[PDB]
C-alpha cells in the first residue's frame, strides 16, 4: 500500500498539501537496490513520523550511468513491508531539466580523508540532497553513519543553507557477534572470521577511554593498535583518529572523534568505524 | 503593529508553525533603507497572502560596511502598509562561521554585468537561498528593474527546486511614464520632456512584438530610429536579449528583455522590459 510518485511536480503537490495539516515527514534518500541497512532507516522513521518517504534516484552527478541496477519493483515492496508511505522516483530529465545555472561545491570537507580520490563526488551528493530536501520537505532525514564523511558534509549543508530538517544518522547493521556486515566477509576462513570480531570490539572498547577521561589522539590510538596486533596476525593496514564533524587529525581532541580501522586479512581487508561524543 | 524578529531560530519556528496551519506567506527580501519601490512589493503581497514577511538584512557577501541602517524607520514604513513581520538577523546569526559549502552562479553571471563585478550575484543567491529556507515563503517578490538578478533568482529557484513562486514587480513610473529614478532631478526642463520617450519607445517594441514581429534586429532599428527622432541627446545603447538566458539572439524564439541607455546633459537614464510569457 505504498505509492510510487514519478514526478517532482506531483511530489511537491502531495507534500505541500500534506504539511498544511500537521502531519510530519521522515525521509530516507537512496539510489535503489535496497538492503536491510536501508530498512533499518525506514523503520526508525516510521516509528517516529506520521508519513515516511523513500526516494530512489540514481543521481548522474556522482558518477556508465544507466548500467547501475534498477529494481524499483523490488525496492518498493521491501520498503512497503516496513511501513513506508511513498517512494519518490523521478526521472533524470525531471530532476535535471537542462543545464544547471547555479553550482554547489563542498569546501574543506571534500578533501579531508580521501579528497582527490574523487573530487567532485560530494558536489554531486549535496546538489541532489539539497534538491530532495526542497522537494520532499522532510522534518527528519536519515543518513547512514558508516560514511561519516558524507554525514558531516550533509550536516554542513543543512547548516549553511538553513534547512529546517533534522539530520538523523543511523548506525551500521552488525552481525550477531558485533562484526560489521560486509560483502567481503564471505572471504574469511573460519579462523579469520572470529579472529575479526575484534575490530567490532577494539572499537566499542576504545570509546570506553573517551567515556571516562582519555582525550589524547596518540594515546587513544596506540591503545587500539596494540589491542589489534594482540588478537590477530594480519597486518593492521590502518588505524586513524580524526575530530568530528571536522574530520581532521589533531594531537589532542575537543569534541567528538572519528575512528577508522582497516585490517587486511587473507583474501579480504575489512574496515569498521564509529564516532562518539555529542557535540 | 508589525513584529520584529531578530533571530534565525525564532523566524524559522514561527514560519514552520504557520505553514502547518495553511496560512500563505509572502516574502520581500531587502537590505533596509526602504522607499516606495519596496512598499509596492509589500502592498502586492499583502493583498494576496495571509501574512507578509519583509526581511531587512545587509548581506556582507555582496560587498567588495558603513551601509545605512534604520530599522526603526523601516519597521514603521512597512507597518503603514500592513506587513506582518520584519526579519532582522545579525550577521553572525546568518553566517555562524565559515561556509563549508559554496554556491556560484554560472553563465548568467557573465552576461552584461557580472564579468564587471565577479561574485556579486554569488553573494545574492547565497543569501536568498538561505532566506527562502528560513522564511519558507509561498511567494517571493523582486523588482523587474534588475532583470539579471531576477533571471538568476528564478534559475536558482528552479535548480534547487524551491517551492516558491517568484513574482516580478513592475518598475514604478512617474505619472508620465518615465521610470522613477534618483537621476531624474538632473534633467533640464527640456530634456525631461524628451526623457518620457524612453518608456514610449518600449511601448513601441512591445507593440511590434505584439504584432508578430520576431527579428531582434528590426525591433532594435525601430526602437533606435524612434529615439533618435524624438531625443536630441545621444542614445548610447539599445540592446535586445532573450530572457531568461539573457543572450543577444538573432531572432526571438521566446520572450525578450530590452534595455536602453540615454546619456543626458548631466545624467544617464535607463529603462527596460520583458515581453512574452514562456
Task: Describe the overall structure.
- Chain A is built from ten helices and ten strands.
- The radius of gyration of chain A is 20 Å and the shape is globular.
- The two termini of chain A are 40 Å apart.
- By secondary structure, the first copy, chain A, is an alpha/beta fold.
- In chain A, the strands form two sheets. A six-stranded parallel β-sheet of chain A has the order 1-4-3-2-6-7, with helices on both faces. In chain A, strands 8-9-10 form a three-stranded antiparallel β-sheet, with helices on one face.
- Chain A has helices spanning 8-19, 36-47, 72-80, 92-95, 121-136, 148-160, 190-194, 201-204, 207-211, 217-231, and strands at residues 3-5, 25-30, 51-56, 86-88, 102-106, 140-144, 166-170, 236-243, 257-264, 269-276.
- Chain A folds into two domains: 3-174, 3-Layer(aba) Sandwich (Rossmann fold), CATH 3.40.50; 175-274, Pantoate--beta-alanine Ligase, Chain: A,domain 2, CATH 3.30.1300.
- Chain A: InterPro entries: Pantoate_ligase (IPR003721), Pantoate_ligase_C (IPR042176), Rossmann-like_a/b/a_fold (IPR014729).
- Chain A: It comes from Staphylococcus aureus (strain NCTC 8325 / PS 47).
- Chain A: Its main location: cytoplasm.
- Chain A: It catalyses: (R)-pantoate + beta-alanine + ATP = (R)-pantothenate + AMP + diphosphate + H(+).
- Chain A: Homodimer.
Amino acid at each position: 500500500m505504498t505509492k510510487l510518485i514519478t514526478t517532482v511536480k506531483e511530489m511537491q503537490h502531495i507534500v505541500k498539501a500534506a504539511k498544511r495539516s500537521g502531519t510530519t515527514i521522515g525521509f530516507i534518500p537512496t539510489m535503489g537496490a535496497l538492503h536491510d541497512g536501508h530498512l533499518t532507516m525506514v523503520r526508525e522513521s516510521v516509528s517516529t513520523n506520521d508519513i515516511t518517504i523513500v526516494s530512489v534516484f540514481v543521481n548522474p552527478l556522482q558518477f556508465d550511468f544507466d548500467a547501475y541496477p534498477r529494481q524499483i519493483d523490488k525496492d518498493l515492496e521491501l520498503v512497503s513491508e516496513v511501513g513506508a508511505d511513498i517512494v519518490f522516483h523521478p526521472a533524470v530529465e525531471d530532476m535535471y531539466p537542462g543545464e544547471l545555472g547555479i553550482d554547489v561545491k563542498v569546501g574543506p570537507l571534500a578533501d579531508v580523508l580521501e579528497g582527490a580520490k574523487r573530487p567532485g563526488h560530494f558536489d554531486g551528493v549535496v546538489t541532489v540532497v539539497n534538491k530532495l530536501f526542497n522537494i520532499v520537505m522532510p522534518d527528519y532525514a536519515y543518513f547512514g553513519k558508516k560514511d561519516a564523511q558524507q554525514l558531516a558534509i550533509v550536516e554542513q549543508m543543512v547548516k549553511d543553507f538553513n534547512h529546517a530538517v533534522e539530520i538523523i544518522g543511523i548506525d551500521i547493521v552488525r552481525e550477531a557477534d558485533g562484526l560489521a556486515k560486509s560483502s567481503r566477509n564471505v572471504y574469511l576462513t573460519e579462523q579469520e572470521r572470529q579472529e575479526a570480531v575484534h575490530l567490532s570490539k577494539s572499537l566499542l572498547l576504545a570509546q570506553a577511554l573517551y567515556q571516562d577521561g582519555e582525550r589524547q589522539s596518540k594515546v587513544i590510538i596506540d591503545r587500539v593498535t596494540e589491542y589489534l596486533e594482540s588478537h590477530i596476525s594480519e597486518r593492521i593496514e590502518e588505524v586513524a583518529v580524526y575530530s568530528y564533524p571536522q574530520l581532521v587529525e589533531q594531537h589532542e581532541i575537543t569534541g567528538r572523534i572519528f575512528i577508522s580501522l582497516a585490517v587486511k586479512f587473507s583474501k579480504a581487508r575489512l574496515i569498521d568505524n564509529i564516532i562518539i561524543g555529542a557535540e
